[PDB]
Amino acid sequence: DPSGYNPAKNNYHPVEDACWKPGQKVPYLAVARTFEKIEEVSARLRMVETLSNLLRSVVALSPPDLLPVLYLSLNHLGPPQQGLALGVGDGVLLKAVAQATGRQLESVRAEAAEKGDVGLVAENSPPPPLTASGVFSKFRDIARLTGSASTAKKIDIIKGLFVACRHSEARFIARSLSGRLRLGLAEQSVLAALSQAVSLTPPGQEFPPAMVDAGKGKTAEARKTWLEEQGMILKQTFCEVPDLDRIIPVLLEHGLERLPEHCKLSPGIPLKPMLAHPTRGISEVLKRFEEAAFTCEYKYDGQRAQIHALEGGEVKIFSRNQADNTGKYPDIISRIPKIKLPSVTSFILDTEAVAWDREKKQIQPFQVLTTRKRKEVDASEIQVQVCLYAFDLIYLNGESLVREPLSRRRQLLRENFVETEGEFVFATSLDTKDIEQIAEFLEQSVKDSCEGLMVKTLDVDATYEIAKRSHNWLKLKKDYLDGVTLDLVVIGAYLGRGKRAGRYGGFLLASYDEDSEELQAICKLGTGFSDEELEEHHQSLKALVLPSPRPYVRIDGAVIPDHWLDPSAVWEVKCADLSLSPIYPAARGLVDSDKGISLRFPRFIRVREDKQPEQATTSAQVACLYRKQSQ
DNA sequence: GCTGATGCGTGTCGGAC
DNA sequence: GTCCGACAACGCATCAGC
Ligand SMILES: Nc1ncnc2c1ncn2[C@@H]1O[C@H](COP(=O)(O)O)[C@@H](O)[C@H]1O
Numbered sequence A: 001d002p003s004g005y006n007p008a009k010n011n012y013h014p015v016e017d018a019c020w021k022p023g024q025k026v027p028y029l030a031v032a033r034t035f036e037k038i039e040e041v042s043a044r045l046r047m048v049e050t051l052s053n054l055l056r057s058v059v060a061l062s063p064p065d066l067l068p069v070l071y072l073s074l075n076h077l078g079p080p081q082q083g084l085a086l087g088v089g090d091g092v093l094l095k096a097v098a099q100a101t102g103r104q105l106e107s108v109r110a111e112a113a114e115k116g117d118v119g120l121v122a123e124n125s126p127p128p129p130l131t132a133s134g135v136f137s138k139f140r141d142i143a144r145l146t147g148s149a150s151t152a153k154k155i156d157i158i159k160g161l162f163v164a165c166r167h168s169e170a171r172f173i174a175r176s177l178s179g180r181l182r183l184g185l186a187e188q189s190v191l192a193a194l195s196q197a198v199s200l201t202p203p204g205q206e207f208p209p210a211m212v213d214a215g216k217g218k219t220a221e222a223r224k225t226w227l228e229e230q231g232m233i234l235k236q237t238f239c240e241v242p243d244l245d246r247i248i249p250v251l252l253e254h255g256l257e258r259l260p261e262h263c264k265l266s267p268g269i270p271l272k273p274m275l276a277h278p279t280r281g282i283s284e285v286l287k288r289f290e291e292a293a294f295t296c297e298y299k300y301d302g303q304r305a306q307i308h309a310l311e312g313g314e315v316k317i318f319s320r321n322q323a324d325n326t327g328k329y330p331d332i333i334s335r336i337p338k339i340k341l342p343s344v345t346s347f348i349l350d351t352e353a354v355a356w357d358r359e360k361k362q363i364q365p366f367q368v369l370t371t372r373k374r375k376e377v378d379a380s381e382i383q384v385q386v387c388l389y390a391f392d393l394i395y396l397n398g399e400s401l402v403r404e405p406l407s408r409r410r411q412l413l414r415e416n417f418v419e420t421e422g423e424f425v426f427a428t429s430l431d432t433k434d435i436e437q438i439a440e441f442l443e444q445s446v447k448d449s450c451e452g453l454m455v456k457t458l459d460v461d462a463t464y465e466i467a468k469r470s471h472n473w474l475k476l477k478k479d480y481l482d483g484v485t486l487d488l489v490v491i492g493a494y495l496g497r498g499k500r501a502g503r504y505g506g507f508l509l510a511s512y513d514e515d516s517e518e519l520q521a522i523c524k525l526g527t528g529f530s531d532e533e534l535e536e537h538h539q540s541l542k543a544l545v546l547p548s549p550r551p552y553v554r555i556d557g558a559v560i561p562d563h564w565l566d567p568s569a570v571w572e573v574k575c576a577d578l579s580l581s582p583i584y585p586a587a588r589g590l591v592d593s594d595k596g597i598s599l600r601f602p603r604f605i606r607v608r609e610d611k612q613p614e615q616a617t618t619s620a621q622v623a624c625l626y627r628k629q630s631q
Numbered sequence B: 001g002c003t004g005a006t007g008c009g010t011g012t013c014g015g016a017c
Numbered sequence C: 001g002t003c004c005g006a007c008a009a010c011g012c013a014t015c016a017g018c
Helices: A028-039 A044-061 A063-074 A090-101 A105-115 A118-123 A132-144 A150-164 A169-178 A187-200 A220-240 A244-254 A282-289 A330-339 A406-416 A435-447 A531-542 A619-629
Strands: A276-278 A294-298 A303-309 A315-318 A347-357 A386-396 A424-426 A429-431 A453-457 A473-476 A486-495 A504-513 A518-525 A563-565 A570-574 A577-581 A596-600 A603-607
Touching: A028 A044, A028 A063, A028 A132, A028 A169, A044 A063, A044 A187, A063 A132, A063 A187, A063 A244, A090 A105, A090 A118, A090 A150, A090 A169, A105 A118, A118 A169, A132 A150, A132 A169, A150 A169, A187 A220, A282 A435, A282 A453, A282 A473, A294 A435, A303 A330, A303 A386, A315 A330, A330 A386, A330 A424, A386 A406, A429 A435, A435 A453, A486 A518, A486 A619, A504 A531, A504 A619, A518 A570, A518 A596, A577 A619, A596 A619
Parallel strands: A276 A473, A386 A424
Antiparallel strands: A294 A429, A294 A453, A303 A315, A303 A347, A347 A386, A453 A473, A486 A504, A486 A563, A486 A570, A504 A518, A570 A603, A577 A596
16 A cells, blocks of 8 residues: 555565555655655665665566656656746745645645655645656646746646645645755665665566566676676766656666667757866965866856767757757857868867957956847847857767866867857866966966866876766865955845755845945845854844834845844855846945845855954945956 | 736755654 | 755846736
């Protein structure tokens, strides 16, 4: 019986402990029961084993449901490049919860805010049982609804789900819709569970499967080593082809050992990009890299563009998160013939697209880039031009370069591609181990409109193998260095969600405007404090809660705090940059008549226990800092 | 026809292991 | 170090209300 389904039990048997009949649809309650057992524990290894048990039963009994169960576990709707999104947030969701439970919407909103979780409100307040594929399909139905009256149609589907929910299902339906499943298990653990499941219980056997536990005859050491090896086969393939729609049919038909024979890196199919680990100083860079020669490059402030040229000439462009951006950049597309030597027949390039001012011939801020339209059919209508800064080459003329060292990938990039100023340029770079030269290069990068340096080894562990290490590169920014900040007043707090439930998750901060003697909201703040500090803030600020705002506190367009606070606490906050804000009033009129100023990537540093609000950073100082950054 | 509100999509940080 | 999920500013696109 699905109500008693226990994928965390000892001696889990994929056949005998499943809670549905062979070949029938996996019930959604089996998924919900699995989620309960996963969120109850903190050790990822234990979460992986529990999910693996569900997956082995899916493989053994009902293999067509493997793909929807995996998406439900990731809370994804499909492969990233297809771009389906629910179009559902707390607004649509709580209205649906309110109507399903028959309660007033304010009562539902208030309880969800206090509890920090929509799932508990949806649950604790005729139709056939939900199935995993049925729920997944309805989720995709919600995402495809568009046009006038689509909100009411989305709500109707959601109410239909809640009406059919049993036991714990409503909790997880609502958390999924809210984007906050909170399992503690995400992409890497799902892949580990999948490789473990298909290794222990191979797909494609006639029911009942003759092989239920392929690890039974191995010592514990041989079992661990084997599962690690199978797990790396799945992880390397997925990093090249992060698309379960392609992988799972192949896995089900040919098994995991033969997977790389059928799914490999190829132009037109986005791959996982290499990411960067933040490093807090040049000395820390030499420590992570030890003896290995490395290169430093400008870290451009734009958007990543993974540019694919297929054999035959089709070009596709993907984002860092593998969204299809091809329709966004008809200007890039028309430029491709200019950037390659005539011998290049296909490639995958790793680049940064940066807004570029063709009148002044210079880079423009990230903010300017974000004003491009999402779709543009005529390059003629484009107003924000872009320059591509190329820094890697992943595939060339039919061959993957993923196992080549950066020294060779970079040489192939420079040898086979053609620069045009203001259109396509190789990232500015420096090969050195001299601490003083690196420090000056870091300074120069900021003067040249970049946010810092990327650092990459050239020959030691210098490949593009994301499954081996996804953060193989280092990012170095001046704002990571100690002593290289603003003192702001806490004027409000926001109730925490999830891991912050039951305390404050965020705070509203303000600068002191000397001329009006008012406090002006400047940004929110929600990271940089330890768990212990955040509880201390909850305890000390609760004494300062007020029913109504003070008349000298101005927040204009900011989110109204859940709790207004008597202005008293002053905190030191660090940011990457200041920005001209559409909503915050701080220093409005000092630089821009209509816009005040906010903080890019603010983080809490420490309490200024001995600073009164009137001695906080002033709005005039905020303006001065913004002007200094703006040349 | 306009607009404000909602949703999606483009970093820093600490905890458990 | 890895994995995960708290939380930031601010843009476009969309849609309900007007
Ligand atoms: N020279 C460069 N090499 C690699 N990434 C770069 C470079 N310049 C800018 N970037 C961007 O920096 C991001 C890496 O930082 P992060 O996303 O913080 O891991 C990439 O996704 C790129 O969009």
